[PDB]
Amino acid sequence: QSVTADPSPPITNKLNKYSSRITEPKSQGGSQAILHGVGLSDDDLLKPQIGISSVWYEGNTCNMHLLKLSEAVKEGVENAGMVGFRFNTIGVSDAISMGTRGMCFSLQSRDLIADSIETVMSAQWYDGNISIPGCDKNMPGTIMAMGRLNRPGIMVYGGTIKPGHFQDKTYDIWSAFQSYGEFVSGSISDEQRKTVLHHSCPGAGACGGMYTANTMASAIEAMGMSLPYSSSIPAEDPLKLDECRLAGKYLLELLKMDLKPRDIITPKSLRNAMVSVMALGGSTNAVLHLIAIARSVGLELTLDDFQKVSDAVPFLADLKPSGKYVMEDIHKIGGTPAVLRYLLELGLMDGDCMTVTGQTLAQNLENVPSLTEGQEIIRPLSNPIKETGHIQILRGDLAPDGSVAKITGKEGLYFSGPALVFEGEESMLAAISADPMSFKGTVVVIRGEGPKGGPGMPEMLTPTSAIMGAGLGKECALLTDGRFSGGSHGFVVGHICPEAQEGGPIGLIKNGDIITIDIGAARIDTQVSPEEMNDRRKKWTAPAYKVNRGVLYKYIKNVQSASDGCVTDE
Amino acid sequence: QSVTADPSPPITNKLNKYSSRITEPKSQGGSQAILHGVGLSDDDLLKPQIGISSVWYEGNTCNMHLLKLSEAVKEGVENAGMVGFRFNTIGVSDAISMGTRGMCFSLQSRDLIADSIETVMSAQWYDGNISIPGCDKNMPGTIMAMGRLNRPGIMVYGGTIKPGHFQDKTYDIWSAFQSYGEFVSGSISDEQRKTVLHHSCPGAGACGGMYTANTMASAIEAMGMSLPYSSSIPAEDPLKLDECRLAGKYLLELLKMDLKPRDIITPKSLRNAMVSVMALGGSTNAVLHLIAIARSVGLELTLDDFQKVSDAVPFLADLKPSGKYVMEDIHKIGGTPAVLRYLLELGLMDGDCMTVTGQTLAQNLENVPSLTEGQEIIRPLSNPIKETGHIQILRGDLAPDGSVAKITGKEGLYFSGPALVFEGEESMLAAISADPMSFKGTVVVIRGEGPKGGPGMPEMLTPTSAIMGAGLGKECALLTDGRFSGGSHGFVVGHICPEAQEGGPIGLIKNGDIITIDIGAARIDTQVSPEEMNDRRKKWTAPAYKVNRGVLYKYIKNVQSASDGCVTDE
Ligand code: FES
Ligand code: FES
Ligand SMILES: [Mg+2]
Ligand SMILES: [Mg+2]
């Protein structure tokens, strides 16, 4: 599709295609005077200008180290004969905001980050970009900006956090999230609870397991938009700083080849990213982010594309949440390149795709050490953890425009039960606390948590933990138009579309309606007749929006459905 | 008005009204684990958390020093017994982008900055904010965020740049903008031109005269949202770092009083800001930014309010662009507090308004040194530069919803001439180059440069300089639905509403239509009959938008008219 967003270069083989707009014409003397004031010499004006976009801030572990990484990227850009100009956008902490109304601001931060980087690159006429995200929503935001601008770019992942260790126990952020419920159930004492909180996050880096950040870092490496090993080198590893110092050398080569994001992000490399998500058991959130990335380069990517790749790619990796190990253990067995080399050898990946190294994926992977002999993290193709991928698309009566579930295969094939409907997370949690037994056998519906109804499509962790804490994990099902962070050991479906705020069938369910989930048929159905459902829709009125001003009201005005990746600029 | 945007504090006299949402409940153990990982002790969890939002980036003189200022703010916050968490948003350089399509991204950056700070403060549950903007659009963006959140906040202006000096000549960014035209006219040699560019911007700080940055810094100080002297201390002055180190002490007192932005930004303090703009000859851009600030706190502010204050307040200050001196000279004669003390003594200002010092404006100004004896920058009330303010609101046939002009009083009372219409800056400049004499006596209309048509309401400097370079300054008039950066010595009107993209009368003007500007009647009229104008409107079709994706398409979808301050969140 013909994306029209950002300025075109003035009208070659020059390396400063964009910055020449302001450094060369005498009519841009004001621009050149500012550039002299910031320290550029006349000779520096002849060089390419690289925008170095970090997402540093001090109040989150995933982002507090990124200013140090940005300094290393700048040094490397200068060492490559170019001008490096650092800038920095916002981000938010999913781990801090989880459980609170601040989570309404998280998903849209991806789109704000994309707008932020697009704005600076366009106004300042930078020739290329190196982005340094370190947290969940940051990663896709930086790629989406690169796709809109279509200027040479590289994403340097800030790296994963290391697990915490204390007194021969290991902890991560998920240990800290689970601490409260374990204390309420009497599984741990208050003092043991406090010990978890002091040792779960030991330093810088993104949350430690195969959750959204590590899913997206790995997928973006598989897509060719990060250098080999970026996704698997830990945040505090000296090799991460070395990658930062090399990004300028690689970007220089991309400027010489004019190898741009829309030359790298293609239908085949989007498929390669999706293959990595299925093989590694990555997060359902990658559906939203990979759709948004595809749209940013003018391509199409639908829920059905995800179902087809899921069916074609087995789940192979024993990594948390589903499994035992964490990202740092992948690092020790050869890293993301070793994993992708195996998937390429199995024929699951397209090796001809160009990448930010200036060569193809197959050329990158030809030389990397293979998975360490004897490793038990990546299963052989003949003994997979699941025959197909975890990610499942469900439609049917109640999700006619789609929905997304993580299906391990241990939940069974079907669930049927009467609906128990809540207009938000708070009322569901109050009910399961006051009367957990009323939840046994039900299909729990938490609605009004979609892109517009939330607002902001918040991710919710407490409902699954509350259900497991009450002993109900395999005894009820959970449905939302929002997102769920965890599994329950039972059926858990998010992203239901249309959302309740938009008058989708989820907004018409009544307590007691019999809902049946059929994984084989890929349907979430209701025993209520289509005619009675249409009767309810004729009487339905959309509730008032929860905001009338500020960034979230703009989001309500702009956001597309979850099946459309919640893009905001169409 | 009942603004609903951001989270409410959990339900006092505590100083951590918001951060207690995440530091106190056992159910927020994940939040506390992240906070330990970023370095907070158990005792630190009891403290207020201050979001310190800077707009640092390396590629603009107005912003390159702001990371150093942010470190000083953090030290002062810690010295005041609180936790300081730095974060940083984007900005763009009007001086670099001027003359290019990158300028389409400038005005909307104000609204992106507001969204950015709102997002972080909300997701992270910070109790208060100290913002450090240093450039044009940054300032109102930070205040708009503070107004939405209504949490205690202080804006620390990054400070003005100093004029450049070389070989007994003085230069500023405007010298550099004018260099090309002077070279084309043969007024200066190419070597003299190059010398201007090397000496116009000597260090850090916002553009040096009473242009938008210094207008807004002064207005925001007059509004009570910056500490005394913030607007007049130069960026490179040691006293600016001292102000940074004191902001935490003042913010602590605001948390103790719960003195919030909506307690400080009121109809009376908005009027005080407007008084400072009129007395100092500040930029027409302040109309857009002060309207947006008023809306952010749920207040009303219209073009007619600006006309009433302009009529009530004389233009008193001999400052560039209109005058001789620059901001650093105001600093030497007692600074912005001395100016405001004089305006308060004259009865032009409401002294009872509360400010970020925890006291009223009158209490702040009681002790400040008055304007230095013998100073000739601020005229006495009995000998003003202009009896009323420079800012004039014009309506009439062609701007029925309003427009904004800077009127010195030396242009005369009326202009009439045939219309010469251009669909953008490029075609106007091509025409004045190829045939300057065809412009003599005309009313030049540059349309399609509005919020949606530009897109982005770009500010245009070249048309006025081209008109003066051709010797036509007092021989034609200039009208736009966009914005003009400079004066021409003749009639120059911007912000014409409705804009051409919206089918306003400006979009129906044809070459040769007789247009009359009447300053006394405050009207821009056409000799074309209302019936023929309505005939043209019935045949008019809106042109296609110039973008279909990215941040500027979102802006097109969200932005209100210039008469409504180009707000995006309503
Ligand atoms: S909060 Fe950053 S990846 Fe979890
Ligand atoms: S570009 Fe920053 S105030 Fe002029
Ligand atoms: Mg996510
Ligand atoms: Mg402005």
Residue numbers in the entry:
A (entry chain A), B (entry chain A): 3 to 13, 16 to 574
In the authors' words:
Dihydroxy acid dehydratase (DHAD) is the third enzyme in the plant branched-chain amino acid biosynthetic pathway and the target for commercial herbicide development. Our structural and kinetic analysis of the mutant AthDHADs has validated the hypothesis that larger hydrophobic amino acids surrounding the active-site entrance enhance resistance to AA.
Furthermore, we also generated mutants of V178, which was shown to interact with the isopropylcyclopentane portion of AA in the AthDHAD–AA complex structure. The AA resistance of all V178 mutants were increased, where the IC50 values were 0.97, 0.43, 6.00, and 2.34 μM for V178L, V178I, V178F, and V178W mutants, respectively. The observed increases in IC50 suggest that the larger hydrophobic side chains of these mutants effectively narrowed the entrance to the active site, thereby impeding the entry of AA into the catalytic region. To probe the acquired resistance mechanism of AthDHAD mutants, we determined the crystal of AthDHAD–I177F (2.45 Å), AthDHAD–V178W (1.77 Å), AthDHAD–V496W (1.59 Å), and AthDHAD–V497F (1.87 Å). The overall structures of the AthDHAD mutants I177F, V178W, V496W, and V497F displayed high similarity with the wild-type AthDHAD, with the RMSD of 0.123 Å (888 core Cα atoms), 0.275 Å (994 core Cα atoms), 0.142 Å (1,034 core Cα atoms), and 0.283 Å (994 core Cα atoms), respectively. Both V178 and I177 are close to the active site.
